[PDB]
Amino acid sequence: KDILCRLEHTTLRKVTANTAIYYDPNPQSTVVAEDQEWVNVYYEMPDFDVARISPWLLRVELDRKHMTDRKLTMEQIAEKINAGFGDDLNCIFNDDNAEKLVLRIRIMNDDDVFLRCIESNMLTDMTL
């Protein structure tokens, strides 16, 4: 099964449950009812300004079933996204506290639909 997962072409689309984009200009007061933001709250990763200044974000929720079957973790997906997108993107994942597997993606510093374009370009050919 491990070799089977290491051979099959697994995109982000086959693993994601649903996705959406939001406008959350204050990560401290995230509008999407999560306190895992403690990371950003105490993160010294560039706060905003030229960084998380992008208020719009990509909130994508994974399912537990395909993450279990493909033998994947949140950190591996985040690392693949970071490697494929450089430092233009910021990814914050979710620990194994609930079944809701959350990836929040922000633009690091065309305007707003570019996030949707890279959402399509990330569902298509990430090659996890």
Partner 1 sequence: QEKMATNTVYVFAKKDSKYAYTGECRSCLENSSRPTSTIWVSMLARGGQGAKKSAIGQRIVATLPYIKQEVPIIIVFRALGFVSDRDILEHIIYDFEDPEMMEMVKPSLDEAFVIQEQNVALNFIGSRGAKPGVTKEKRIKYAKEVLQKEMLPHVGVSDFCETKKAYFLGYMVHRLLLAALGRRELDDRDHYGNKR
Partner 2 sequence: PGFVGIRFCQECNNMLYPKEDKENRILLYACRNCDYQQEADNSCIYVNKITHEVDELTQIIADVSQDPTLPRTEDHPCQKCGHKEAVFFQSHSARAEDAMRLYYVCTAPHCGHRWTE
Q: Which of 75, 100, 112, 124 binds partner 1 (CB under 8 A)?
A: 124
From the list partner 2, partner 1, none, pick the one residue 121 interacts with, judged by a Cβ distance below 5 to 8 Å according to partner type: partner 1
Under rule CB under 8 A, residue 108 binds partner 2: no
- Give the nearer residue to partner 2 in terms of CB position, either 18 or 97: 18
**How far apart are the C-alpha atoms of 101 and 98, rounded to whole Å?**
7
Under rule CB under 8 A, residue 121 binds partner 1: yes
3-class DSSP state of 57: strand
Residues 71-110 that bind partner 1 (CB under 8 A): 110
Helix spans in 1-128 (H): 2-7, 38-42, 64-69, 74-85, 113-124
Answer yes or no: are the C-beta atoms of 127 and 79 closer than 8 Å. no
**How far apart are the C-alpha atoms of 95 and 54, rounded to whole Å?**
24
List of residues contacting partner 2 (CB under 8 A): 13, 16-26, 31-32, 55-56, 63, 111-112, 116, 119, 123
